[PDB]
Amino acid sequence: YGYTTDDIEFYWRGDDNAVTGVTKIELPQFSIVDYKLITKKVVFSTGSYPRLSLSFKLKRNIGYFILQTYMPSILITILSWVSFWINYDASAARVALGITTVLTMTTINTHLRETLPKIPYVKAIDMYLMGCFVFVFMALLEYALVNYIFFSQPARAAAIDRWSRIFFPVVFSFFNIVYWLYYV
Amino acid sequence: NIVMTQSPKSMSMSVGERVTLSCKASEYVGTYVSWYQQKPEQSPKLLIYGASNRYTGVPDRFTGSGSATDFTLTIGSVQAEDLADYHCGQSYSYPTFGAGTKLEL
Amino acid sequence: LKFGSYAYTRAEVVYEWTREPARSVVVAEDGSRLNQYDLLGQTVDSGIVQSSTGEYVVMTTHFHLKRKIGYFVIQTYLPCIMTVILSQVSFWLNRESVPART
Amino acid sequence: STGEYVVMTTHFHLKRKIGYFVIQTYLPCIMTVILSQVSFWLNRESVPARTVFGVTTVLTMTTLSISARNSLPKVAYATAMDWFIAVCYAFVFSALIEFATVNYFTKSQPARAAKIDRLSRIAFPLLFGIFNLVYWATYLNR
Amino acid sequence: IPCTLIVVLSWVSFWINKDAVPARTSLGITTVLTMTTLSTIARKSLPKVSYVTAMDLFVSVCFIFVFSALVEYGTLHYFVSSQPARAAKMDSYARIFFPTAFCLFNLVYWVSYLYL
Numbered sequence A: 001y002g003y004t005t006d007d008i009e010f011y012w013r014g015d016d017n018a019v020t021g022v023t024k025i026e027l028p029q030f031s032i033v034d035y036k037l038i039t040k041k042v043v044f045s046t047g048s049y050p051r052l053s054l055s056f057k058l059k060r061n062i063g064y065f066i067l068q069t070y071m072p073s074i075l076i077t078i079l080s081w082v083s084f085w086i087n088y089d090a091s092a093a094r095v096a097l098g099i100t101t102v103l104t105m106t107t108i109n110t111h112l113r114e115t116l117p118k119i120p121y122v123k124a125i126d127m128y129l130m131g132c133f134v135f136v137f138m139a140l141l142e143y144a145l146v147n148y149i150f151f152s153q154p155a156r157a158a159a160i161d162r163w164s165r166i167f168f169p170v171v172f173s174f175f176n177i178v179y180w181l182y183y184v
Numbered sequence B: 001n002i003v004m005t006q007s008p009k010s011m012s013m014s015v016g017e018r019v020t021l022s023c024k025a026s027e028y029v030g031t032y033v034s035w036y037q038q039k040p041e042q043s044p045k046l047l048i049y050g051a052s053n054r055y056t057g058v059p060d061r062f063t064g065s066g067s068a069t070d071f072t073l074t075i076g077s078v079q080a081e082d083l084a085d086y087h088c089g090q091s092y093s094y095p096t097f098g099a100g101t102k103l104e105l
Numbered sequence C: 001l002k003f004g005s006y007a008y009t010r011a012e013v014v015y016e017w018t019r020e021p022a023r024s025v026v027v028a029e030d031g032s033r034l035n036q037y038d039l040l041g042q043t044v045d046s047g048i049v050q051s052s053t054g055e056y057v058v059m060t061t062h063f064h065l066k067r068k069i070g071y072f073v074i075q076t077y078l079p080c081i082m083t084v085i086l087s088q089v090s091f092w093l094n095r096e097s098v099p100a101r102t
Numbered sequence D: 001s002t003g004e005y006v007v008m009t010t011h012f013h014l015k016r017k018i019g020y021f022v023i024q025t026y027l028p029c030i031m032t033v034i035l036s037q038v039s040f041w042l043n044r045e046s047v048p049a050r051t052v053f054g055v056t057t058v059l060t061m062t063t064l065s066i067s068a069r070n071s072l073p074k075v076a077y078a079t080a081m082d083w084f085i086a087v088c089y090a091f092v093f094s095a096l097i098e099f100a101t102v103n104y105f106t107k108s109q110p111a112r113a114a115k116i117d118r119l120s121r122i123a124f125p126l127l128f129g130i131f132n133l134v135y136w137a138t139y140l141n142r
Numbered sequence E: 001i002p003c004t005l006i007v008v009l010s011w012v013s014f015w016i017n018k019d020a021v022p023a024r025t026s027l028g029i030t031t032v033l034t035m036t037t038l039s040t041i042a043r044k045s046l047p048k049v050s051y052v053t054a055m056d057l058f059v060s061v062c063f064i065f066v067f068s069a070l071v072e073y074g075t076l077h078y079f080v081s082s083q084p085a086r087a088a089k090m091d092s093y094a095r096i097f098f099p100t101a102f103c104l105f106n107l108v109y110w111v112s113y114l115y116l
């Protein structure tokens, strides 16, 4: 603080061995990738002062988060897909299933919400939740369009239902793979 | 960098009438404005420092009104010996001065 | 951020900025721990405050902040729009299927 | 081990106030159980209504148990409120099982289904009243 | 106990008639939402540990039972049109099959953790 480079000077004693005990350290959800030791001088308005920096690198563990969050969202998508098999007659059943799936996804999103601080940017997990919501919402809109069209033509409704049944899992797989590859 | 515009560029009246001078700052200067008067063939003299504080050895006739950007100098009951220029300057940043105001009669 | 003297009136202790007032409060380039805010700038003013014990000098500094709306857009606005759209979806449902609309 | 010492002791005698626990825990339990028996009075034909009554009541009782358990510190043994919640949970579960049995026996022996429905209607309120009376009289007077 | 009783609840759908499709669907989804919220409540009291733990195992497996029951019911509804007789066959055999699985799994889990 009070002594400049004309008065004092710092250095790590036994450079490599100066800091010890990092290897034995464990964190509940982090892994110490490595650490570095710097030695520089910082210039303030009152002079130049010696400085030392001990910096770690911490990598998060995805198993916790995978299990806690990624599974339930994909599973709600699974239920939204199961909704298609149900015959067009049971409008109430399919509608209730889909809306309840939406609400469950919102519940898991909310449970995520309390943990992290407010931040302007969108995190990766937020991106995945948004994508899953787009999938579910498009499925429900597709069913609404099917119901509207059916009275004009029932065969069109059946064929379009089969078409969506076959493709939505494919598009979900594609988006999931591209997202994972982008963020890994 | 900061422009100070003085209005009016010139104005006059008879002895005893209230006279007001206005100086406006392009940007924010927080009461770091000053007023000087320069008699002919003389160096400037400080009149008002800060927004309103009156410099020692100055008559109570002069008074300054402050703001963030709009400042004014009022000479209540102007006498017949106040016939000099009047410069507004800001010191919030590197000092700049206004074009000055000429007072006659 | 206002500071002054405790127990020393203006007649005894007076404060002043070391350099030009515009350059007397410096913010480090790398030091900003704001999460949902932006620091546009700062301004300094020097005044006088009246109190029972006397009349004091106050140095004032304002830090101008603007809130970031990115978090709230995803958090509330989009969910509200989507809920409104889902509520609309009810119109296109067939009149017969009362339970679905309920 | 370092000698004999004089120890001065004082005891402050406290008694808990129950009103908050009444309003937050017991009253909702009573209401949910009452809803569970209200389920019986519906027509057997309206299967979905009875199904949703049963499911929602069981769920409300589960959530009230997890909510009530958090107030007091974690402890191995069980508290009186825990027994009350457990018994109300048992009543809700038995009501739902009764509905399932009635459904099974429907379309095979309407008379037997109606008889068991009436018998359960008369029995459940009686059993709940007996249990509630005994529990309250037991704990209040001591 | 709450997880065990939720798994117990998921059964009752089976006894109910296949015709009441909305009832079974609503019950299944409500139970799934319950299992999710209960899993969430359970975890918070614990520190965030990467390695799986015993309490994670029980919650996960009970959740799997619930999901399997609902999925099998949906597949049953689809297959009823294809083969109603096979549908009733599967209802009865599910009724008699799953309970043994759940109980033997419970016993294996408990005895294994007692042994260690």
Ligand SMILES: *[C@@H]1O[C@H](CO)[C@@H](O[C@@H]2O[C@H](CO)[C@@H](O[C@@H]3O[C@H](CO)[C@@H](O)[C@H](O)[C@@H]3O)[C@H](O)[C@H]2NC(C)=O)[C@H](O)[C@H]1NC(C)=O
Residues within 6 Å of the ligand: A034, A035, A036, A038, A040, A055, A056, A057
């Ligand atoms: C974490 O962040 C810090 C800060 O950004 C990283 O420290 C940086 O480390 C590099 C490599 O040691 C430094 O580069 C060096 O710069 C000097 C300047 O003369 C040069 O002579 C060397 O050849 C080398 O290139 C860099 O200056 C330093 N950053 C600062 C601000 O000092 C650190 O590497 C990051 N990671 C970890 C695991 O700590």
Ligand SMILES: CCc1c(C(=O)OC)ncc2[nH]c3cc(OC)c(OC)cc3c12
Residues within 6 Å of the ligand: A102, A103, A106, A109, A129, A130, A133, A134, C074, C075, C078, C079, C080, C082, C083, C086
């Ligand atoms: C509209 C669905 C929804 C609901 C609900 O059930 O309203 C019907 N509730 C909470 C929600 N939080 C969300 C966050 C999202 O991503 C930024 C999102 O995707 C755009 C959707 C929701 C959402």
Ligand SMILES: CCc1c(C(=O)OC)ncc2[nH]c3cc(OC)c(OC)cc3c12
Residues within 6 Å of the ligand: D023, D024, D027, D028, D031, D032, D035, D060
């Ligand atoms: C309708 C009863 C109920 C239920 C339920 O689902 O029962 C059908 N669930 C949660 C509840 N919290 C309550 C808090 C109260 O007091 C402020 C209260 O006062 C009468 C009732 C409830 C209550």
